[PDB]
Amino acid sequence: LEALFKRHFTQVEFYQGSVLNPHDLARVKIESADACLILANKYCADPDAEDASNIMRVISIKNYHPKIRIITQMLQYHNKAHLLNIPSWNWKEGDD
Amino acid sequence: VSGRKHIVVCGHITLESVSNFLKAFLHKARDDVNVEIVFLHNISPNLELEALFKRHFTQVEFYQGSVLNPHDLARVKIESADACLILANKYCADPDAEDASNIMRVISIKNYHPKIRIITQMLQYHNKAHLLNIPSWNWKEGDDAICLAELKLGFIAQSCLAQGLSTMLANLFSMRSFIKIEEDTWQKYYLEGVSNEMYTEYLSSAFVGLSFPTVCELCFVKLKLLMISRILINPGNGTLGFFIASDAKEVKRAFFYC
Amino acid sequence: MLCFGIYRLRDAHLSTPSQCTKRYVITNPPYEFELVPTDLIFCLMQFD
Amino acid sequence: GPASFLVSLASCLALGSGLTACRARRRRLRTAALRPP
Amino acid sequence: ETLHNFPKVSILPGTPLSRADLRAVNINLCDMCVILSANQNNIDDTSLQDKECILASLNIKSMQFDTTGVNIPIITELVNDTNVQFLDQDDDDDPDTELYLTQPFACGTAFAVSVLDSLMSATYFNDNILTLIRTLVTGGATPELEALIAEENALR
Amino acid sequence: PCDSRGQRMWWAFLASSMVTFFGGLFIILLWRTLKYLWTWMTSVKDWAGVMISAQTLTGRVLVVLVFALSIGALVIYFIDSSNPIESCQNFYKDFTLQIDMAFNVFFLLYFGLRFIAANDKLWFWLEVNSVVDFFTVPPVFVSVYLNRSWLGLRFLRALRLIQFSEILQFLNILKTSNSIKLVNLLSI
Ligand SMILES: [Ca+2]
Ligand SMILES: [Ca+2]
Ligand SMILES: [Mg+2]
Ligand SMILES: [Mg+2]
């Protein structure tokens, strides 16, 4: 992965931190970010647990900055409905 | 040591648990204490725990032993111990195992010296009843069992009655200090409020002579104290009275009132 | 009625109007504590 | 060697005893001065 | 088995997070909604801890009634003291700020067992404090009642 | 006028150190045997214990002084090791010996305070810090008395570097496990 990052030297940056930690979000300057893309583990043993973790990440990001576009991958429909149940999640401004 | 009391602390002994216990016990706002805290655990402390014990050099001692072993109880001088505080693992996988282990610890301690006072923690009510069924365990001499689930559900139910009472009580029985906030925010008023602890004091003869509302308002207006075999909560119509005040120094004047 | 404290609006002290509903608790206010009409007061009833 | 060590031990013990006696006296006076207004 | 002797108790079988179930019981017209988790101790790992309580709190806060759901009185139990920052979207979250200065705790909308541990210290210095706390939250839990509930394991 | 060294005597310093150690050990053992089947002290002990740890501002001052003066004593040992093993040096001329005098006086007072604060006197006697205090200060006093210097067991001053980790822990400087382990390993 370090070699892959070095290949895209001027386009890709990497940082170590947690989405649940507001200090880490402040480090990556997520308040000025155009969007926040949340990848998902498609081949996960428990899809419900992965969906819950993704929902938790979305909750944390919206808690820090509630005016950022978030594009996420979801594995189940009911978890998607729960995601749309979030107070700060709105599809009109680009949240998908 | 003659004149120096000591208490034996056992059970769930970790870095965070011991740090919290020492923060709550040897508090600056707390009056000058004269007791020694003797920890007894079967696992040797880490480097961080060793440093924490080194910071409290003259107030905290550690001895490696098992509560179930009577020899270890004899080593920590549990016969002369003022009390034994048994800590519990509230964040356990299953409360049944932790509660059963606490039952066994209490059984062993009461087996060694049945006249000692024990303060313990519980996660279930039926385990508290099982503790209450122990022969040597009697609640009149000082034995207590703080039930976490029972107390938390009582706090939640009271908050359902008046919203915000749970945090009131939680800040009320927790030892804190005085903080002044220059900025005119809600935090300033909240920190002004949180600085009140709860104390008990014997009322004077004149206070006993009069009625409860009269002495309560007299304490509030003159002494500036809010005064809250059975415990009577704000009755209608010598004795121990429960006060809410910034520190015990203000409570002490209730006994000295003329 | 024995009153412990008050349950004051979070934005009560602010001059700028707001629609916030959350309130914070104040325990044992002093005798000369300034009081706001939009308040709830914890207290006790002596009646079965 | 032993003479100097005993001298240091006695000096430290005497200093500690004097300081703790002074502290006890100060505590007694400051507790007695609290009762009267 | 321990609740059949109490009047005015009803049970709604279903997910506590579904909006239809909460609308049926008229969650807007209620004195308090208490979100409790039973198997919250099993889940070990903060990245996988207290999902349901926070998600349900946000779901109830996001409801719309023909008024909005942010005025519903809610109290939530938590086991991780750092998860209190996700309960409210208006406060300034900080992992360094301790629990009792956090806005949900100051407003009485959150609770955790980590604040009761200090009781032990108080219980050592004044057991009257513990008995006053017990007799204030449970509504006069007398020790004879404790013995009775220890014998029959029920209420007579 | 800057003469040389001649007769060689070294049993004075070593004998003084051995007396200071073994006599105290024998007195402690004799007291224990006498107490065995008869064959305010707590206050001053607690005060000394509070003094030893950085509990009070004066405690932190004493701890920092112990650190600095142990380092200085090691440096003075280096400087003296640059000199011949056995030499004659008058007290009033060389400025090194007065500094060593002050350092050893401070270390002797610190040892006395630690003994006052100690729980078990016998086990305190058999301590590395106490031992290096036994074999360093009496030799310095004998040397300043006899106006002659021998490079005796002065390397034991380096053994004062072991207590650095505990010294830093008292001052609330080391808190984490990794830093504590690193300091312990480096000092040892
Ligand atoms: Ca308090
Ligand atoms: Ca927040
Ligand atoms: Mg770049
Ligand atoms: Mg001790």
DSSP category for residue B219: I
Q: How distant, in Å, are the alpha carbons of F12, F88, F112, F124 from that of F145?
A: 11, 12, 22, 29
E148 touches chain B (CB under 8 A): no
Kindly tell me the number of DSSP H helices and DSSP E strands found in chain F.
Answer: 9, 2
Q: What type of residue is F179?
A: S
Q: How far apart are CA F100 and CA F70, in angstroms?
A: 11
Quote the distance between the C-alpha of residue E41 and its chain's center: 15
Resolution of the structure in the document, Å? 3.6
Q: How far apart are CA F48 and CA F115, in angstroms?
A: 9
Say how many Å lie between the CA of residue E144 and the centre of ligand 3: 73
Helix F41-52 with D2-32: angle, nearest 10 deg: 100
Question: What is residue A71's three-state secondary structure?
Answer: strand
Q: How far apart are CA A72 and CA B195, in angstroms?
A: 46
* CB-based contact A85 E58, cutoff 8 Å: yes
Structure tokens at D23: 């502290």
Q: How far apart are CA F63 and CA F110, in angstroms?
A: 10
Q: How far apart are CA E53 and CA E34, in angstroms?
A: 10
Quote the distance between the C-alpha of residue A8 and its chain's center: 22
Q: What type of residue is B217?
A: E
- The candidate with the shortest Cα–Cα distance to D25, out of A1, F43, E154, B129, is F43
Please answer whether residues A82 and E59 qualify as being in contact, where contact means their C-beta atoms are separated by less than 8 angstroms. yes
Residues with CB under 5 A from ligand 1 (ion): B 171, 174, 176, 197
Please answer whether residues B227 and B204 qualify as being in contact, where contact means their C-beta atoms are separated by less than 8 angstroms. no
- The continuous run of DSSP H or E covering B146 comes out as strand B144-147
Q: How far apart are CA F87 and CA F6, in angstroms?
A: 9
The experimental method behind these coordinates is: cryo-EM
Count of CB atoms situated within 10 Å of the CB of D27: 11
Q: How far apart are CA A77 and CA A96, in angstroms?
A: 13
- The continuous run of DSSP H or E covering B41 comes out as strand B35-41
F170 touches chain B (CB under 8 A): yes
Question: What is residue E49's three-state secondary structure?
Answer: coil
Q: How distant, in Å, are the alpha carbons of A62, C13, E52, E133, F4 from that of A90?
A: 11, 32, 21, 45, 95
- The candidate with the shortest Cα–Cα distance to B116, out of B96, B99, B136, is B136
C10 touches chain E (CB under 8 A): yes
- The candidate with the shortest Cα–Cα distance to E65, out of E109, E32, E19, E31, is E19
* CB-based contact E62 A23, cutoff 8 Å: no
* CB-based contact F108 D5, cutoff 8 Å: yes
* CB-based contact D1 F43, cutoff 8 Å: no
User: Which ligand has the minimum distance to the alpha carbon of residue B170?
Assistant: 1
On the 0-12 / 13-18 / 19+ scale of CB atoms within 10 A, E54 is: buried
Q: How far apart are CA D18 and CA F162, in angstroms?
A: 33
Q: How far apart are CA E64 and CA B182, in angstroms?
A: 39
Q: How far apart are CA E51 and CA F11, in angstroms?
A: 77
- The candidate with the shortest Cα–Cα distance to E150, out of F70, B206, B132, F18, is B132
Q: How far apart are CA E122 and CA B24, in angstroms?
A: 9
Please answer whether residues B124 and B131 qualify as being in contact, where contact means their C-beta atoms are separated by less than 8 angstroms. no
Please, what is the end-to-end C-alpha distance for chain E in angstroms? Answer: 14
